[PDB]
């Protein structure tokens, strides 16, 4: 958040959550970011650098995370045609 | 009468089959002699007490595993059953066929061998 | 898949998913369970999509590749069939197994001696192993588990679907699972026979 | 019944963003609800959205984020006079910084922040942040 | 005589990597939304800017056959003048272990506040963002933003709390029974934690994503460490 300088205020921006855009307070112990790991995908071998991803507790806690998780490596990849 | 053996008694009892289990017969006199001499028990009365539950569990050792305390070699048939199992070596019989619409599946997925057709009735508990 | 083949299902595999009878679900159903269904027969008996299947087995394995410590992938299974699988899975992979009764506590205390800080869980059935589900969001954990038609998903994040009702449906996909995670970080790679095999991932099953 | 269309369109597209969806149905579209949206979609809450035409008086599909606190009607409609201005945007905003007073004019549908620029007063309809 | 303390060794992951000074601030830990398990971890980062304020010191009781028995029940609030705050309660059969058990207790549930400005600049925040509320149990609190040099209007108890925020102008009114001040406090530290969970135009902008503390401190953690 900017002042009269631009200068940033704020003691830390917090994180938005991927298919929920909203964000997740200091406390909040149900929202869980999700290592997923490239490969190459000539040998199917890894590959270094990953895709993160971030979910917030209230999809979690519901039972909708599993959908969102999954739409998310649709638009990407790996997951072709479902 | 009553008499039932307190947590004390228990407790020690497991412990000094364990790590003692060679030691032991099936006797009451000789399991006593024992326990003194791998422990103290700073009472007469009690060590005639602890004597007489190592006794005891030792009989029922010799047959199928307790489930209070671990010995050695049972733990070795434990991994013996828990490598291999003599029923199979086969994946599951090699070869099993499955009933239609689980071959519709397997026709829009590039497989179409190995199958069997058979229809049954409607429907459920009909 | 990804890549084009080299990831893609096999048709060797497709046999040992027929004979396991994992295509087969239960009755009842769920309406998150609904997209993984293809349709029913004529008798009560819900056909699980294979190629389904096979997708959500991939990006599973690929997560629990991603992290940099194995050994901290805490498995848990409680059922009797569920026991001998996982022992194996852990044994062979760098991961720890928690066998049999959860003990509650395991993950939020500072007393206890069993405390453990994992990141990753792999949970066979919710509706036997509901405790940890119930922990693992109080700490923060990413959850993987296998879910089956009637098994409702709620505090787990990617569910790998499965007829688990107690079968050789259980350890095939145990064995599977492991054998993934390998062709990525491990040499096994080649992708043609593994000399382990699922024939000792199956049930003890009281012999004669 | 149906006394008042707008009044009734909101809560739905408010209770769907709380249980966190992304596509709604709103019925039956009247042209106020959508000079309504226009506006508020430039500012940025929601994306594009598509009007269903149907004989009747059509069906309204809308995709949207979770940028969306919340949308309010205001009802009966009262007058505003550019000095009263002041007094209801305080009571009906989270802050003077952000937020969005809705009317219309003789000059059209639009924000508070523009009819100012203006210098048209009307009759207020509803809000959001 | 006799010298040197030792106090402090962690049984907890993410006390262990403050301990070893490669965690650098709270602000991390509060990004990733993590769990404090420990006292200390944050009395390593202040301890030299942390005041308290015993708020009340009440008495609860229950019957038995024998008669009455009694154990104090004391809140007791905690901050710095920067923008963490905290709040907590704890009962015990006497005093003194009682409040310190709160102190304890109390440092465990800290959280930074999120200021703002009125309705213009000129550098150093001074209110609230926006207008939030809090609830506890019929107890509500409405705070209110308010231009600088206002002071901090309200009641008693809300004037400790958002006195140590570092919020120094603010209007505030609340509704239903107050008198029962456990839930009074409770509500406004509910308000102040809503700061941070209230979505503003400015944070519409995407993360990046970046990478857990635990995964890339995860080298050292690989001994036996848990």
Redesign the interface.
């Known amino acids: 958040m900017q002042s009269n300088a631009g200068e940033f205020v704020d003691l830390y921006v917090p994180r938005k959550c991927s298919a929920s855009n909203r964000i997740i307070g200091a406390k909040d112990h149900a929202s869980i970011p999700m290592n997923v790991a490239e490969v190459d995908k000539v040998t199917g071998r890894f590959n270094g650098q990953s895709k993160t991803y971030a979910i917030c507790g209230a999809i979690r806690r519901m039972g909708e995370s599993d959908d969102s998780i999954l739409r998310l490596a649709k638009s990407h990849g790996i997951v072709s045609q479902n | 009468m009553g008499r039932v053996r307190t947590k004390t008694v228990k407790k020690a009892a497991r412990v000094i089959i364990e790590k003692y289990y060679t030691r032991l017969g099936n006797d009451f006199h000789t399991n006593k002699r024992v326990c003194e001499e791998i422990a103290i028990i700073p009472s007469k009365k009690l060590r005639n007490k602890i004597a007489g539950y190592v006794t005891h569990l030792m009989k029922r050792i010799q047959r199928g595993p307790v489930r209070g305390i671990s010995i050695k070699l049972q733990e070795e048939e434990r991994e013996r059953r828990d490598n291999y199992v003599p029923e199979v070596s086969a994946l599951d019989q090699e070869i099993i066929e499955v009933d239609p619409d689980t071959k519709e599946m397997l026709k829009l997925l590039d497989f179409g061998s190995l199958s069997n057709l058979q229809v049954t009735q409607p429907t459920v508990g009909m | 898949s990804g890549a084009l083949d080299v990831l893609q299902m096999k048709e060797e595999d497709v046999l040992k998913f027929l004979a396991a009878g994992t295509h087969l679900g239960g009755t009842n159903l769920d309406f998150q369970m609904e997209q993984y269904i293809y349709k029913r027969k004529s008798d009560g008996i819900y056909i699980i999509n294979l190629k389904r299947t096979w997708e959500k087995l991939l990006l599973a394995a690929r997560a629990i590749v991603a992290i940099e410590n194995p050994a901290d992938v805490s498995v848990i299974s409680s059922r009797n069939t569920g026991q001998r699988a996982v022992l194996k899975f852990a044994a062979a992979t760098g991961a720890t197994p928690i066998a049999g009764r959860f003990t509650p506590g395991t993950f939020t205390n500072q007393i206890q001696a069993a405390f453990r800080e994992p990141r990753l869980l792999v949970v066979t059935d919710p509706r036997a192993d509901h405790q940890p589900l119930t922990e693992a969001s109080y700490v923060n954990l990413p959850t993987i588990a296998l879910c089956n038609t009637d098994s409702p998903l709620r505090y787990v994040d990617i569910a790998i679907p499965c007829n688990n009702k107690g079968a050789h449906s259980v350890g095939l996909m145990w064995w599977m699972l492991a054998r993934e995670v390998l062709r990525m970080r491990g040499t096994i790679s080649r992708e043609h026979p593994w000399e382990v095999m699922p024939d000792l991932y199956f049930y003890r099953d009281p012999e004669e | 019944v149906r006394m008042n269309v707008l009044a009734d369109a909101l809560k739905s597209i408010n209770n769907a963003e709380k249980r966190?969806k992304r596509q709604v149905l709103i019925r039956p579209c009247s042209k106020v609800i959508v000079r309504f949206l226009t506006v508020m979609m430039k500012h940025?809450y929601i994306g594009e959205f598509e009007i269903i035409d149907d004989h009747r008086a059509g069906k309204i599909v809308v995709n949207l984020?979770?940028?969306l606190?919340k949308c309010g009607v205001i009802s009966p409609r009262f007058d505003v006079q550019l000095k009263d201005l002041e007094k209801w945007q305080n009571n009906l905003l989270?802050?003077?910084?952000?937020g969005f007073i809705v009317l219309t004019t003789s000059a059209g549908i639009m924000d508070h922040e523009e009819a100012r620029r203006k210098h048209t007063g009307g009759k207020i309809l509803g809000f959001f942040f | 005589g006799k010298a040197g303390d030792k106090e402090w060794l962690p049984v907890t992951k993410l006390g262990r990597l403050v301990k070893d000074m490669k965690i650098k601030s709270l602000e991390e830990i509060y990004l990733f939304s993590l769990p404090i398990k420990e006292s200390e971890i944050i009395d390593f980062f202040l301890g030299a800017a942390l005041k308290d304020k015993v708020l009340k010191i009440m008495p609860v009781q229950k019957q038995t056959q024998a008669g009455q028995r009694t154990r104090f029940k004391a809140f007791v609030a905690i901050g710095d003048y920067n923008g963490h705050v905290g709040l907590g309660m704890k009962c015990s059969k006497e005093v003194a272990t009682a409040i310190r058990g709160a102190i304890i207790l109390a440092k465990l549930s800290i959280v930074p506040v999120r200021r703002g400005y009125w309705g213009n600049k000129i550098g150093k925040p001074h209110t609230v963002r926006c207008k939030v509320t809090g609830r506890c149990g019929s107890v509500l609190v409405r705070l209110i933003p308010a231009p600088r040099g206002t002071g901090i209007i309200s009641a008693p108890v809300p004037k400790k709390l958002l006195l140590m925020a570092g919020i120094d102008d603010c209007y505030t009114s609340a509704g239903g029974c107050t008198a029962t001040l456990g839930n009074f406090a409770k509500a406004t530290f509910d308000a102040i934690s809503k700061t941070y969970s209230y979505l503003t135009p400015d944070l519409w902008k995407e993360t990046v994503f970046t990478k857990s503390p635990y995964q890339e401190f995860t080298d050292h953690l690989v001994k036996t460490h848990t």
Do not use: D
């Not at chain 4, 989270?94 to 952000?98: G, I, L």
């Open positions: 966190g940025g984020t979770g940028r606190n989270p802050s003077r910084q952000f």
